[PDB]
């Protein structure tokens, strides 16, 4: 079943399973294989694989990792995916003495926004956007990957899982216990990623939920009823929260130009209703000169 694939090395482990680099012996295609250990008399096929496969077979897009096949054995399940060369986190690491050239940053964000609008227009929430789940190739593409925490949503949304998003990229409405979250949580993550590509350090690296909330509040101001109607009634909202004054965005990501700051501040708006959708962000003046430089590795 796996007869025509030749394993090359282990790539890593994400939300569930294990990923390897492999080579199709007959066609030459290099692929990533995500091995899913099943068993039986356990839970059967994990809900994470069920959601990942059914959603990725629907999501055909240049900026979304392409699921090529599913090899479904009595014992194991193997997801065959197009092979990407590196993760954004490793690329930023490799660039941290020099920095990522502005045009590559803009192209990467433009591409991420396209992948994300396509997800959201197909009723899919990603819910784990972070630099290690964003994969680049040597032709300048960048693609959303690891849909292990994703889910299909309904209009209007109902309550979904609370334990979502790695903490440094987690939106405020999740941190505060909102009953309903939606597509704005993936935009907040991407806005933290955009800042991180530019400063090359995580915008809000908290070590706990309340630390994460205070880090966000010291940068954007502690939210009130004016900025975010309803904030004070949120479940984990506390009247004892320190009231920090909002920082001037030119000080938040100092190298960003006016267009860039305007775009980042709309991706980090507190109120998920005012936070910019991915579709609308693609027409932001920041991208008027977007091109596609590649990366290197």
């Amino acid at each position: 079943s796996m007869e025509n694939f030749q394993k090359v090395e282990k790539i890593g482990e994400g939300t569930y399973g294990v990923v390897y680099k492999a080579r199709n012996k007959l066609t030459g295609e290099v692929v990533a294989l995500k091995k899913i250990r099943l068993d039986t008399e356990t839970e059967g096929v994990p809900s994470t694989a069920i959601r990942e496969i059914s959603l990725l077979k629907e999501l055909n897009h240049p900026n979304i990792v392409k699921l090529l096949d599913v090899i479904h054995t009595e014992n194991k399940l193997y997801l065959v995916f197009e092979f990407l060369h590196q993760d954004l986190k490793k690329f930023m690491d490799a660039s941290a003495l020099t920095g990522i050239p502005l045009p590559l940053i803009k192209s990467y964000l433009f591409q991420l926004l396209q992948g994300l609008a396509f997800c959201h227009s197909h009723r899919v929430l990603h819910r784990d956007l972070k630099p290690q789940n964003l994969l680049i190739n040597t032709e300048g593409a960048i693609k959303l990957a690891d849909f292990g925490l994703a889910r299909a949503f309904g209009v209007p949304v109902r309550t979904y899982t609370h334990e979502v998003v790695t903490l440094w990229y987690r939106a405020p409405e999740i941190l505060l216990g909102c009953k309903y979250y939606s597509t704005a949580v993936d935009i907040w993550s991407l806005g933290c990623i955009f800042a991180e590509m530019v400063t090359r350090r995580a915008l809000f690296p908290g070590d706990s939920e309340i630390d994460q909330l205070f880090r966000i509040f010291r940068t954007l101001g502690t939210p009130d009823e004016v900025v975010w109607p309803g904030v004070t009634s949120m479940p984990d909202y506390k009247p004892s929260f320190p009231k920090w004054a909002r920082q001037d965005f030119s000080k938040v990501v100092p190298p960003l130009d006016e267009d860039g700051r305007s775009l980042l501040s709309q991706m980090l708006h507190y109120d998920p209703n005012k936070r910019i959708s991915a579709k609308a962000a693609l027409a932001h003046p920041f991208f008027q000169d977007v091109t596609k430089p590649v990366p290197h590795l």
Binding site: T40, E41, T42, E43, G44, V45, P46, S47, I50, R51, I53, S54, L55, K57, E58, V70, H72, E74, H120, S121, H122, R123, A152, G154, V155, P156, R158, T159, Y160, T161, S182, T183, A184, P272, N273, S277, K279, A280
Partner: protein
């Protein structure tokens, strides 16, 4: 947050045609019948109530059973096993805390083993080729509810109730797409509770008018009128609860004047 409401609606319209079960499959099933499928669905409604599952979970399980039975011949003693595996898969896909496999094994009262449930889960995945994100009547209802002037909780729960009743009876409801059943259930609920009719803003959205909803609506009306007599009664009982505003013992209108 309506930036994608129309892209999503358009996409669900495209996918419900691709997820559509085969309209006359029961006449190709040697051993099972419409009435046997009614008994299975009624039972799944009871299971959803017992583990407090979402209504969407129920609608997805049923879509999985109808698509599985569309290409797989099943003996009557195994129909519950297919329905159990489908309900397990739908719980995994849609629920925050699905029941565990042992809970599914227990509620078949040990008719099957855990090993058979897990082997059937895999068979259903392979038959449906892992394509489980199917549009449901419930997903179209919820988008239609947004057009209400003002919102009416009785209208919503009664449209859910009517949409659910259509799951039980393959004949006639397997002919109608999820969006159309939802349009009939929304109009019927609205007319029963308020006197109002399918709004003009939903003709613009959907393209459906009362004339195009007419065949489904005539079918749904009769189902509504005859509900108290149907051999399956778990949906009327579930909709006696206050969680659903007691809508099942609202009186159906005698005529629709269409």
């Amino acid at each position: 947050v309506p930036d994608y409401h129309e892209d999503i609606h358009t996409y669900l319209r495209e996918m419900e045609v691709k997820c559509k079960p085969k309209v006359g499959y029961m006449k190709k099933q040697p051993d099972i019948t419409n009435s046997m499928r009614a008994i299975l669905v009624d039972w799944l409604v009871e299971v959803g109530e017992e583990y407090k599952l979402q209504n969407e979970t129920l609608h997805l399980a049923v879509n999985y059973i109808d698509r599985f039975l569309s290409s797989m011949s099943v003996l009557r003693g195994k129909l519950q096993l297919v329905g159990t595996a489908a309900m397990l898969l739908a719980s995994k896909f849609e629920e925050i805390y699905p029941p565990e496999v042992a809970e599914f094994v227990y509620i078949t009262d040990d008719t099957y083993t855990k090993k058979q449930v897990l082997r059937m889960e895999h068979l259903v995945l392979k038959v449906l080729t892992f394509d489980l994100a199917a549009p449901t009547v419930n997903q179209f209802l919820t988008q239609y509810f947004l057009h209400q002037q003002p919102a009416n909780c009785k209208v919503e729960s009664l449209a859910m109730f009517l949409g659910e009743l259509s799951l039980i009876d393959a004949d006639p409801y397997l002919k109608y797409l999820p969006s159309v059943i939802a349009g009939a259930a929304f109009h019927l609920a609205l007319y029963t509770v308020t006197g109002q009719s399918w709004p003009e803003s939903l003709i613009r959205k959907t393209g459906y008018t009362l004339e195009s909803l007419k065949p489904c609506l005539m079918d749904l009306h009769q189902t509504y009128l005859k509900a108290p007599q149907h051999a399956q009664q778990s949906i009327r009982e579930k909709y006696k609860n206050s969680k659903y505003h007691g809508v099942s013992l609202l009186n159906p209108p005698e005529t629709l004047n269409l």
